[PDB]
Amino acid sequence: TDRPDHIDSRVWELSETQEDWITQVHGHVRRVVECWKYTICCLISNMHTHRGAPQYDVFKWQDRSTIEWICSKKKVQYPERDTPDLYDNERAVAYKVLLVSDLSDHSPTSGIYHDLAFNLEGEAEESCALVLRGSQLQDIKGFLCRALEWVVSNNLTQEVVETISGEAKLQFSVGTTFRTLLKRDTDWDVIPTPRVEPNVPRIEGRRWTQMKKLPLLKEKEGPPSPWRALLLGADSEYIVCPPGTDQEAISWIHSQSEIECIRESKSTPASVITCLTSSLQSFAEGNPVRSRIHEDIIAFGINKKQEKKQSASSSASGEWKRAEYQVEEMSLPPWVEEEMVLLRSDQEDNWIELEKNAIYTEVDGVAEGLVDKYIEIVGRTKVASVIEKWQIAATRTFSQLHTDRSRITACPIITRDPSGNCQFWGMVLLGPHHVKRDTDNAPLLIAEIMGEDTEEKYPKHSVFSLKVEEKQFLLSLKITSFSRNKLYTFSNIRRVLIQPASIYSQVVLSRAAENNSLNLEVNPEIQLYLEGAQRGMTLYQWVRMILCLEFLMAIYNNPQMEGFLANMRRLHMSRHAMMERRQVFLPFGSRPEDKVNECIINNPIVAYLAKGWNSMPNVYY
Amino acid sequence: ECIRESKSTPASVITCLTSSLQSFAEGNPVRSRIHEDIIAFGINKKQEKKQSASSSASGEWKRAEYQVEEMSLPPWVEEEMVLLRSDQEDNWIELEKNAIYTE
Amino acid sequence: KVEEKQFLLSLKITSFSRNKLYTFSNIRRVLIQPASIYSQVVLSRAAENNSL
Amino acid sequence: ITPLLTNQGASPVHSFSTMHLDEVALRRHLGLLDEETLRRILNPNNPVTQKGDPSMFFRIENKMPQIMEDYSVPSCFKYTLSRNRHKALLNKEERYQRVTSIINKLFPEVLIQEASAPGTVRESLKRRLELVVERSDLDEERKKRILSRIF
Amino acid sequence: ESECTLRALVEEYNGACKEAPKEMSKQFTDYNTFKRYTTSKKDHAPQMRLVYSVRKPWPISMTPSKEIPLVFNGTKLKDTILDLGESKRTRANIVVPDYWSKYGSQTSLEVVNAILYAEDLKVQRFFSTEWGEIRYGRMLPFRKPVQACPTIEEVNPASIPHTLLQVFCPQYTTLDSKRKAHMGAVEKLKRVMEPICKVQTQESAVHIARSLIDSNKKWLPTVVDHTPRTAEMAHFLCSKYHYVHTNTQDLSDTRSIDNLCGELVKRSLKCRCPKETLVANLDKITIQGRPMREVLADHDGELPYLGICRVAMGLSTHHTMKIRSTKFSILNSDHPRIEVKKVFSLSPDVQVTIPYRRFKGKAKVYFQNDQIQGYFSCTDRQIDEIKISAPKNAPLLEPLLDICYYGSFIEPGFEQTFGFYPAGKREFVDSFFMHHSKDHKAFLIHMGLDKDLSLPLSPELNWKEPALSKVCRVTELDSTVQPYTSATREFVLGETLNVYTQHENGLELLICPTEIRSTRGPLPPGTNLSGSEFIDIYQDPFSRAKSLLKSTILHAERCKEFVGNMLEEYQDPAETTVQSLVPINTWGKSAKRKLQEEITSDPDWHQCPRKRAKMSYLAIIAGSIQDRDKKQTNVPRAFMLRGSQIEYDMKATRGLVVDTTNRIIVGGETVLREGKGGPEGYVQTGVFEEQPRCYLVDTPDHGLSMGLSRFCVHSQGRYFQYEKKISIWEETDNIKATIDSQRDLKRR
RNA sequence: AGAGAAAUCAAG
RNA sequence: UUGCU
RNA sequence: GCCUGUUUUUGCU
RNA sequence: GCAAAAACA
RNA sequence: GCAAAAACA
Ligand SMILES: *O[C]1[C]([C]OP([O])(=O)OP([O])(=O)OP([O])(=O)O[C][C]2O[C](N3=[C]N([C])C4=C3N=C([N])[N]C4=O)[C]([O])[C]2[O])O[C](N2[C]=NC3=C2N=[C]N=C3[N])[C]1O[C]
Structure with a gap:
C-alpha cells in the first residue's frame, strides 16, 4: 500500500x-x-x-x-x-x-x-x-x-x-484580499462554523397514493398530420430498367418518358419539373453537375432569405415583443393505419441480401440459422425494399455534400435485383449548398415514384403522371431542406432490423432454454391486445410489424418522439408491474402522464402510439 | 543458448528440459505440466488439426491416393559407417560370465 | 557450457510406440549376428587343422 | 487481383466465435491467405504506410541495444486518409512534440517508468548522449569526432 | 552500423536545441507534463467522412517513393506532380494497397511470423480448445472480474515496470530493480521479443510485452462453476441462454504454492507464537530466484493456505467460506458469527470439547453449489426465509444440509450429543453428515409444512416437484442476488493463523486452520527452504541435506549455532533433518570428541569454509540416532545417507560435497567460488549525478559476476556505486532483534 | 417557398 | 463521373 | 459549436 | 499518456 | 511429430 x-x-x-x-x-x-x-x-x-x-x-x-x-x-x-x-x-x-x-x-x-x-x-x-x-x-x-x-x-x-x-x-494558504473576494457571495467564512445545534427536524409530509388505474394519454385535436418525411415510405415504387449502370438507366428512362402534370401544389410549383428533366439531361451524358437554370431559383429557394428579410422589413410595424413561438397541434391521421397495413405485404425478392458469416463451430451454426430464419421471415416485405431505397438515397445524397457547390447535383435512386435489372426509385437533386456546419439545412428536390396519391397525405407534393413504355407511374417531386447529420444517420438505416431480430431471437432462445433443446422453427402464439381485446397472433407477423413500426419511428424521430419514448418507459414498466398483481404507489403531486402528454403535439406516429396505449385496458384485476 | 533453430522442434521446449533436469534433481522424476509442454508432446494436437481441417474444408471427397517421396542416398552414410568404429578406452559391454564344467 | 567445455545439445520432438521401444530395449541381440561369422571362421580354422 | 481480404470484397473470415481473432492471422491459419501475399501485405518497408521520420528500435541481447532506421506500419492496409487543407501555441506544442520525441529516443527507460533524471533537459540529454556514445564499442577517433559536433 | 544511429541522435539533439531554444531549459522531470500536449491529432468525426474520404480522387496520403509506379496499367496511381518533397505529401488512390498486395516486394518469412506472433497465439488458442456441446438452461448471471487474456507468466503489478526494464534496457537499471523483477518472465519475454523487437518500435514492443505479462481484469457476467478463467472466449462459451461444456486443466503452479504454504502453516503451528514464525520464514524462503513475498503477491488464488500466507504478508485474499461442495458469503449481518465453546465432557475429569459457530442477531447469507444458488435470511438460529434458484427436479439435500451446518439451525448435532461419546471434531461432523443424509425430517420439523401447492420445494427435497404438501418459507429466487463488497476488505491474521475479516461489530472469521483438509502435494519447482528452521519439508534426502549444508557453509553464525546446538544436545531447529539423514549407528560420542579437539585447537575455525564443512559433517554424525546395543566405534571417513546411494565425505573429495582449492560445490552446485563472487551480497552505498571513481559496468548483470569491490550502474542520469557488504547480519534480522528486545523489555 | 420546432437554415 | 438489395 | 463524472472498444506515442 | 467512438447520469 | 497405408498424437 x-x-x-x-x-x-x-x-x-x-x-x-x-x-x-x-x-x-x-x-x-x-x-x-x-x-x-x-x-x-x-x-x-x-x-x-x-x-x-x-x-x-x-x-x-x-x-x-x-x-x-x-x-x-x-x-x-x-x-x-x-x-x-x-x-x-x-x-x-x-x-x-x-x-x-x-x-x-x-x-x-x-x-x-x-x-x-x-x-x-x-x-x-x-x-x-x-x-x-x-x-x-x-x-x-x-x-x-x-x-x-x-x-x-x-x-x-x-x-x-x-x-x-x-x-x-x-x-x-489563502491570502487576505483573496479571502475577501471569496467571502463576497456567502454568509460564512472560508471554514464555516455555524452556531446552530446539529439536529434533524420533523416535517409534516404528504401521503403516497396508489395508482389504481393507468393514466390515459390525451389525444390532440386538429387537422390530420401530413406525411412529413424525406421519402414516401409504403407508397414508394420503382421502374424496371434494363441492366446496366445508373447513367444508362437514366438515359433509357429520359428518352422514353412523358411527363404530364395532374396535381399541382402551392408549396411545390409544377414549373420546377423542367429542373428534373434538365438534371436528367445532365446525367444522360455523364454530368451529375449542371449549371443553374431559372426555375432552380424557385426550386431550391436561391436568395430566398434576403427576399424574405426585405419583405419583412417593408411590412414591419408595431412594437418589439418577445418571440412567443407556436407549434401547431395536429391529430392522428388515417394514413398511419394504412401505412401499417401496407409496408407488410409480401414481395417477390428477398430485399435483404447480406453476406453470410463464416461457420466454424456449432454455436456459429445455430447463430447463422437464427439469422437466416429472421431474414427469411422479414426479408420478403415492403419494409426491406423501402429501407434499401432510403439507405441508397441517403448515401447518394450524403456523398455529394462534403463540398461547396453553386450548381445543381443529381443523385439518382437506383437499386438492382438479382436478375440485374435496374430499379428506379427516383432521383434527388441537391441545389447550391455551402455548408458551414453539420446541422444546417441544404436544399433538395425529391422526385420519386408513387403507388397511390392522397391529397390529405401529400399536400405539399406535386403529383405528375409519367408514361414509360405503355406503363403509367406517379411522380412526387417535393421541395425539401435536409441536414447533413440526418442524411448520415439515414445512410445507416439498415441497423433498424436489430430490434425486431432481438425480440425474435429472445423468444426463440427462451423457448430453447425452457425445453433444453433448440427448435429454430417455433412460431408460438403471442397474446396481444389487438382491437381492445386480447387475441393470439403468430410470432412471424408480430416481428414483421414490429419491424414496420420500428422503421416508421426511425424516419419520424424528432424531439417530440424522443421525449415521448423516453417518458413512456415508466408507464410501460408500471403496466407490466400491474399485470403481475403488483400495486403501484405514487408521490403527492405525481402525474406521470403529463411528461408524456407534453411531447404529444403533431407527430403522427407519436399519436399512433398514444392511441395504441389508450386502446389497451387501463385497469387490471 | 540456441545455435540452430528448426520449425519441427521449437526452441521453447528447452524450457521443458530445464524444467525436468531441475525436477529430477529434486527427487521428482515426474513433474507437473507447464505451458511450454503444450507444444512439446502434441497435447490437444488431434483436436487442433481436426477443427482446423473442418473449418478449412473445401471441395469434394476423393480417393486418398497416398504417395511416398523418393529420396537419394545421403552423403552422411559413409561417415556414419566409418565413425561407429572409433576405438574406445572402455569395453562398453558388461555380461556376467557363466559357469564352466566341460572343455 | 560445462566446466569451460563445449558441447552441442540436440532436442527432437518425436513419438514412438511401445512395440518399438520394447524391441529396442533388447537391442543387444544385434551382437549375435556378427559373432556367428567369427565363430564359424574360428571353427573353419579348426576344420583346417583340428587345433583351435 | 483476387481480393483475399474482407475490405477487398473477399468472403468474410470472421465468425461469431472468431470476433476476437485478427483477420490476417486467421486467414493465414485457415490457408485462405498464402505466404506469397503475406510477405507482401506485411512488409515493414512498404511505401504505403511508411512513416515520415526514422524511428528507434530495441535490440535484445545485442552489443548496441538502440538501432534507428526508417520504418513502415507492417500492414499496407493500415494507411492514413488525407485531410483537406491558439495558433502560435500549436507551434509551441509542436516544439514540445519534438522535445518529447528526442527524449523518448535518448531515454528509453522513461518509456516504462516516470521521468526522474536531474538537471535541465539540455544537460540531461547531453550527458545521456555522451554516455551512449561512450558505450558504442566504436574506436576512440569515432567517439571524439562524434562528440565534437554536439551542440 | 551503430555509427549512423549516433549521427541521427546527435543531429536530432542539435535540431531540438536550435529549433526549440525553450522547452529544453525546463527540468527533465517536466517531461511528465508536456508529454501530454498532443493536439492537432484531433478530428471532428471520422465515421461521418469515411465514405466521402475513400471516394476522393487521391484519398491516401503517403511519403514519396519510387516503388509505386507513377502510372500503372491504364490507371494513374500516385499524384506526385504538385508539391513533391513535403514530407507525407504524395497522394495515391485507394487501389494502391490493392496494387501492393500483388506485384510488390516481399519480406523474409521470419519477419511475417514475428509480426503475427501475438495474434497467432490467439488464433491457435481458439483452434485448440475442445468445443463441447451446447447446453441450454436459462442461466442466472454471476458478475465477477475475470482476466481479459492469458499471460505467459503471473507477475504482480508492482513488479511490472521493473521486469520490462530488465528486458529492454538492462543498461539503465539498478540492482534493486533487478531484484524486484521476475527473472523467469524476463527470460520468457526476451526469448519472445528477440524477433518481435526487430519489426516493432520501442513503445510498441513495450506494449506487447506488458500485454503479455499483465492481467487487466474486467467485469463480466459468467456462469457458476463454468468460468473459462479468461474473457477471451466468453462470447462463444456462454450467452445467457447456453454454455459450451469445455474441459481444461489448471495449467498453473498455484496448487504447488498452496502445498508449500500448507506445509509451512502446519509446521508453524507447532511452535510458540506461530504468526511471527511464519512471517519470519516467509521472508527467508525463495522460489527459483524470487522471494516468497513477491511470489505470494503474484498468485492471488482462491485457496485457503495461499490466502493465509498472503494475509501474513499484508496482502488480501479472495477465499470464501466453503462447506464441502457449497460456498457461502454473508451479504450483511448485525453481528459476526459468534463461536460457542460447547463442552461434551466424556467424564467429570476427562472432557472433550467441540466448539462450533452460529449467528447472533439477523443475518443474510448467499450460497451456491453446482448449478443451485440463492440466499437465506435467518435470525439467531431460526431460519426466516430461503430463496433458491435451481434446475427442475434437482436434488437439494446437500445444499440445505450445508446451510444447516453453516448456521447450526438444526440441533440433532448442535447444543446436544448424538449418542455415544464423540471421539473428536472429525468423527462428530462425519456422523452429523451421515445421519442427516438419510434423515432430512429435521428440516421439515424445523420449518413445518405448508398446504399451498405453489411452493416449489418438495418434502423430499426436489425443486419444482409435485407433491401433497410443500416446505414453507422456501421460494424461487425473485431477482438475481450476488455477493458484492464495496469497501475494500482488510484482513487480520490472529494467533493460530486465523484469517479474520474486519466486521463492524467485531471480527468475522474467514479462514481457520485445523479443519482445512488437503493431501500432501508436490512442492513448487525451484523452492529453496535453506533459509531457516524448515528443512524437513523436503521429502528427498538429497535436497534435504543440500539445503542444510548450504545454510551451514554460507553463514558462519549459522554454522556456529548448529555446532553448539548439535554438540551439547541443545534444541536445534533442524534435529529431524539430522536424524533422517544419517542411519542408525554408533559414531555419536566419537564425533563429539572430534568436535572437542577441533574447537579447542582452533577456536577461530568458523571463518574457513573447509573448516565449516568438516565441523558440520562431524556435528551431523554426532547427533544421529545412536544404536542402543552396539558399542561406540570410530567415526568413518565417509558414510551413506538413508534410503539413498549418496555418499557424504569428511574431506569432501567426492560425493555430495566437493571442495577443490578453486571452489566448493555442494550437491552439484558451486556454493562457493574463491576469488570472485563472495558469499555475502552488496549494498548500494551512494547515489551521484556524476561518474564516481569506480568501474562502470554495463548492466546489473555482467555485474555480481566479476566480484569487484566497487562498481557503478547508471539509471536516469544517476550513478549507483555498489561496493560490498561487510556486516555479518541483515537489516531484517536487525529490525526483528530490536523489536523483540523492545517487546521483551516492555513485558519484563 | 420549404425544412423545422421554443429559433435557426434557406451565402455571398 | 455514376453500381450496398 | 461539441461541459463534468463513470464505464466500455480500438489504435498511436 | 494521447486520439477517436459509444452508452449512461 | 511418429509412422506407413489412416493409425496414434
Ligand atoms: O494513466 C496511465 C497509467 C495507468 O496505467 P498502469 O496500469 O498504472 O501501468 P503504468 O504505465 O506502469 O503506470 P505508471 O507507472 O503511472 O506510468 C509508467 C510510465 O511509463 C510511461 N509509459 C507507460 N506505458 C505502459 C507506456 C508509456 N509510454 C509510451 N510511449 N507507451 C507506453 O505504452 C507512462 O507515460 C508513464 O510515464 O500508466 C500510463 N500509461 C498506461 N498505459 C500507457 C501509459 N502511458 C503512455 N502510454 C501507455 N500506452 C498512464 O499515465 C502516465
Whole structure:
C-alpha cells in the first residue's frame, strides 16, 4: 500500500500510531523520515551485547511508562520534550539520531544527549563516525542510500529536504484580499462554523397514493398530420430498367418518358419539373453537375432569405415583443393505419441480401440459422425494399455534400435485383449548398415514384403522371431542406432490423432454454391486445410489424418522439408491474402522464402510439 | 543458448528440459505440466488439426491416393559407417560370465 | 557450457510406440549376428587343422 | 487481383466465435491467405504506410541495444486518409512534440517508468548522449569526432 | 552500423536545441507534463467522412517513393506532380494497397511470423480448445472480474515496470530493480521479443510485452462453476441462454504454492507464537530466484493456505467460506458469527470439547453449489426465509444440509450429543453428515409444512416437484442476488493463523486452520527452504541435506549455532533433518570428541569454509540416532545417507560435497567460488549525478559476476556505486532483534 | 417557398 | 463521373 | 459549436 | 499518456 | 511429430 519498499513492514506498522501525521506538514514524508530514524536506531543496535544484554537500548517508539521504568535504574532522567533515541550501556551515553542536509556546519545540542548526525547520502559526522563501528556505518549508509534512491525515483527530493530542514510550509494558504473576494457571495467564512445545534427536524409530509388505474394519454385535436418525411415510405415504387449502370438507366428512362402534370401544389410549383428533366439531361451524358437554370431559383429557394428579410422589413410595424413561438397541434391521421397495413405485404425478392458469416463451430451454426430464419421471415416485405431505397438515397445524397457547390447535383435512386435489372426509385437533386456546419439545412428536390396519391397525405407534393413504355407511374417531386447529420444517420438505416431480430431471437432462445433443446422453427402464439381485446397472433407477423413500426419511428424521430419514448418507459414498466398483481404507489403531486402528454403535439406516429396505449385496458384485476 | 533453430522442434521446449533436469534433481522424476509442454508432446494436437481441417474444408471427397517421396542416398552414410568404429578406452559391454564344467 | 567445455545439445520432438521401444530395449541381440561369422571362421580354422 | 481480404470484397473470415481473432492471422491459419501475399501485405518497408521520420528500435541481447532506421506500419492496409487543407501555441506544442520525441529516443527507460533524471533537459540529454556514445564499442577517433559536433 | 544511429541522435539533439531554444531549459522531470500536449491529432468525426474520404480522387496520403509506379496499367496511381518533397505529401488512390498486395516486394518469412506472433497465439488458442456441446438452461448471471487474456507468466503489478526494464534496457537499471523483477518472465519475454523487437518500435514492443505479462481484469457476467478463467472466449462459451461444456486443466503452479504454504502453516503451528514464525520464514524462503513475498503477491488464488500466507504478508485474499461442495458469503449481518465453546465432557475429569459457530442477531447469507444458488435470511438460529434458484427436479439435500451446518439451525448435532461419546471434531461432523443424509425430517420439523401447492420445494427435497404438501418459507429466487463488497476488505491474521475479516461489530472469521483438509502435494519447482528452521519439508534426502549444508557453509553464525546446538544436545531447529539423514549407528560420542579437539585447537575455525564443512559433517554424525546395543566405534571417513546411494565425505573429495582449492560445490552446485563472487551480497552505498571513481559496468548483470569491490550502474542520469557488504547480519534480522528486545523489555 | 420546432437554415 | 438489395 | 463524472472498444506515442 | 467512438447520469 | 497405408498424437 503506502509502505515504501525499503521500509520494513513491522516498522511501518509500528509507526502508524506514534504521531498524528494528518496535521503535520508532509505527513507521509514525515512518517517515512521517522521510519528512517527508527531503522537507523535498529541498525545501530544489531546483535551487540556487553554483559549478556543488548549494548544499546532504543527509547524511540516505546511506551513512556516503561521508558521511565528503565530510565530510573540507569541513574538518569530526561524531559518529555526531547527524549534520546537510544542509549549505550557499555559507554553509558544517550544518543539522538539526526538527519541533516549538510554535515560541514553541525553544532552540538542539549547536553542530555549527543547527536548522531547523518547525511542524506549515508555519511556521518566525524564524532558520529568514530563512536560507531565500521559495520554500523556501512549498514546505515546502505539503508540511507536505498532511501535516497527511493526518494529520487519518486521525485520527492524537495519534500524530503523541506521536512529535514524543518521550514514546513503549509502547502496551501489563502491570502487576505483573496479571502475577501471569496467571502463576497456567502454568509460564512472560508471554514464555516455555524452556531446552530446539529439536529434533524420533523416535517409534516404528504401521503403516497396508489395508482389504481393507468393514466390515459390525451389525444390532440386538429387537422390530420401530413406525411412529413424525406421519402414516401409504403407508397414508394420503382421502374424496371434494363441492366446496366445508373447513367444508362437514366438515359433509357429520359428518352422514353412523358411527363404530364395532374396535381399541382402551392408549396411545390409544377414549373420546377423542367429542373428534373434538365438534371436528367445532365446525367444522360455523364454530368451529375449542371449549371443553374431559372426555375432552380424557385426550386431550391436561391436568395430566398434576403427576399424574405426585405419583405419583412417593408411590412414591419408595431412594437418589439418577445418571440412567443407556436407549434401547431395536429391529430392522428388515417394514413398511419394504412401505412401499417401496407409496408407488410409480401414481395417477390428477398430485399435483404447480406453476406453470410463464416461457420466454424456449432454455436456459429445455430447463430447463422437464427439469422437466416429472421431474414427469411422479414426479408420478403415492403419494409426491406423501402429501407434499401432510403439507405441508397441517403448515401447518394450524403456523398455529394462534403463540398461547396453553386450548381445543381443529381443523385439518382437506383437499386438492382438479382436478375440485374435496374430499379428506379427516383432521383434527388441537391441545389447550391455551402455548408458551414453539420446541422444546417441544404436544399433538395425529391422526385420519386408513387403507388397511390392522397391529397390529405401529400399536400405539399406535386403529383405528375409519367408514361414509360405503355406503363403509367406517379411522380412526387417535393421541395425539401435536409441536414447533413440526418442524411448520415439515414445512410445507416439498415441497423433498424436489430430490434425486431432481438425480440425474435429472445423468444426463440427462451423457448430453447425452457425445453433444453433448440427448435429454430417455433412460431408460438403471442397474446396481444389487438382491437381492445386480447387475441393470439403468430410470432412471424408480430416481428414483421414490429419491424414496420420500428422503421416508421426511425424516419419520424424528432424531439417530440424522443421525449415521448423516453417518458413512456415508466408507464410501460408500471403496466407490466400491474399485470403481475403488483400495486403501484405514487408521490403527492405525481402525474406521470403529463411528461408524456407534453411531447404529444403533431407527430403522427407519436399519436399512433398514444392511441395504441389508450386502446389497451387501463385497469387490471 | 540456441545455435540452430528448426520449425519441427521449437526452441521453447528447452524450457521443458530445464524444467525436468531441475525436477529430477529434486527427487521428482515426474513433474507437473507447464505451458511450454503444450507444444512439446502434441497435447490437444488431434483436436487442433481436426477443427482446423473442418473449418478449412473445401471441395469434394476423393480417393486418398497416398504417395511416398523418393529420396537419394545421403552423403552422411559413409561417415556414419566409418565413425561407429572409433576405438574406445572402455569395453562398453558388461555380461556376467557363466559357469564352466566341460572343455 | 560445462566446466569451460563445449558441447552441442540436440532436442527432437518425436513419438514412438511401445512395440518399438520394447524391441529396442533388447537391442543387444544385434551382437549375435556378427559373432556367428567369427565363430564359424574360428571353427573353419579348426576344420583346417583340428587345433583351435 | 483476387481480393483475399474482407475490405477487398473477399468472403468474410470472421465468425461469431472468431470476433476476437485478427483477420490476417486467421486467414493465414485457415490457408485462405498464402505466404506469397503475406510477405507482401506485411512488409515493414512498404511505401504505403511508411512513416515520415526514422524511428528507434530495441535490440535484445545485442552489443548496441538502440538501432534507428526508417520504418513502415507492417500492414499496407493500415494507411492514413488525407485531410483537406491558439495558433502560435500549436507551434509551441509542436516544439514540445519534438522535445518529447528526442527524449523518448535518448531515454528509453522513461518509456516504462516516470521521468526522474536531474538537471535541465539540455544537460540531461547531453550527458545521456555522451554516455551512449561512450558505450558504442566504436574506436576512440569515432567517439571524439562524434562528440565534437554536439551542440 | 551503430555509427549512423549516433549521427541521427546527435543531429536530432542539435535540431531540438536550435529549433526549440525553450522547452529544453525546463527540468527533465517536466517531461511528465508536456508529454501530454498532443493536439492537432484531433478530428471532428471520422465515421461521418469515411465514405466521402475513400471516394476522393487521391484519398491516401503517403511519403514519396519510387516503388509505386507513377502510372500503372491504364490507371494513374500516385499524384506526385504538385508539391513533391513535403514530407507525407504524395497522394495515391485507394487501389494502391490493392496494387501492393500483388506485384510488390516481399519480406523474409521470419519477419511475417514475428509480426503475427501475438495474434497467432490467439488464433491457435481458439483452434485448440475442445468445443463441447451446447447446453441450454436459462442461466442466472454471476458478475465477477475475470482476466481479459492469458499471460505467459503471473507477475504482480508492482513488479511490472521493473521486469520490462530488465528486458529492454538492462543498461539503465539498478540492482534493486533487478531484484524486484521476475527473472523467469524476463527470460520468457526476451526469448519472445528477440524477433518481435526487430519489426516493432520501442513503445510498441513495450506494449506487447506488458500485454503479455499483465492481467487487466474486467467485469463480466459468467456462469457458476463454468468460468473459462479468461474473457477471451466468453462470447462463444456462454450467452445467457447456453454454455459450451469445455474441459481444461489448471495449467498453473498455484496448487504447488498452496502445498508449500500448507506445509509451512502446519509446521508453524507447532511452535510458540506461530504468526511471527511464519512471517519470519516467509521472508527467508525463495522460489527459483524470487522471494516468497513477491511470489505470494503474484498468485492471488482462491485457496485457503495461499490466502493465509498472503494475509501474513499484508496482502488480501479472495477465499470464501466453503462447506464441502457449497460456498457461502454473508451479504450483511448485525453481528459476526459468534463461536460457542460447547463442552461434551466424556467424564467429570476427562472432557472433550467441540466448539462450533452460529449467528447472533439477523443475518443474510448467499450460497451456491453446482448449478443451485440463492440466499437465506435467518435470525439467531431460526431460519426466516430461503430463496433458491435451481434446475427442475434437482436434488437439494446437500445444499440445505450445508446451510444447516453453516448456521447450526438444526440441533440433532448442535447444543446436544448424538449418542455415544464423540471421539473428536472429525468423527462428530462425519456422523452429523451421515445421519442427516438419510434423515432430512429435521428440516421439515424445523420449518413445518405448508398446504399451498405453489411452493416449489418438495418434502423430499426436489425443486419444482409435485407433491401433497410443500416446505414453507422456501421460494424461487425473485431477482438475481450476488455477493458484492464495496469497501475494500482488510484482513487480520490472529494467533493460530486465523484469517479474520474486519466486521463492524467485531471480527468475522474467514479462514481457520485445523479443519482445512488437503493431501500432501508436490512442492513448487525451484523452492529453496535453506533459509531457516524448515528443512524437513523436503521429502528427498538429497535436497534435504543440500539445503542444510548450504545454510551451514554460507553463514558462519549459522554454522556456529548448529555446532553448539548439535554438540551439547541443545534444541536445534533442524534435529529431524539430522536424524533422517544419517542411519542408525554408533559414531555419536566419537564425533563429539572430534568436535572437542577441533574447537579447542582452533577456536577461530568458523571463518574457513573447509573448516565449516568438516565441523558440520562431524556435528551431523554426532547427533544421529545412536544404536542402543552396539558399542561406540570410530567415526568413518565417509558414510551413506538413508534410503539413498549418496555418499557424504569428511574431506569432501567426492560425493555430495566437493571442495577443490578453486571452489566448493555442494550437491552439484558451486556454493562457493574463491576469488570472485563472495558469499555475502552488496549494498548500494551512494547515489551521484556524476561518474564516481569506480568501474562502470554495463548492466546489473555482467555485474555480481566479476566480484569487484566497487562498481557503478547508471539509471536516469544517476550513478549507483555498489561496493560490498561487510556486516555479518541483515537489516531484517536487525529490525526483528530490536523489536523483540523492545517487546521483551516492555513485558519484563 | 420549404425544412423545422421554443429559433435557426434557406451565402455571398 | 455514376453500381450496398 | 461539441461541459463534468463513470464505464466500455480500438489504435498511436 | 494521447486520439477517436459509444452508452449512461 | 511418429509412422506407413489412416493409425496414434
Ligand atoms: O494513466 C496511465 C497509467 C495507468 O496505467 P498502469 O496500469 O498504472 O501501468 P503504468 O504505465 O506502469 O503506470 P505508471 O507507472 O503511472 O506510468 C509508467 C510510465 O511509463 C510511461 N509509459 C507507460 N506505458 C505502459 C507506456 C508509456 N509510454 C509510451 N510511449 N507507451 C507506453 O505504452 C507512462 O507515460 C508513464 O510515464 O500508466 C500510463 N500509461 C498506461 N498505459 C500507457 C501509459 N502511458 C503512455 N502510454 C501507455 N500506452 C498512464 O499515465 C502516465
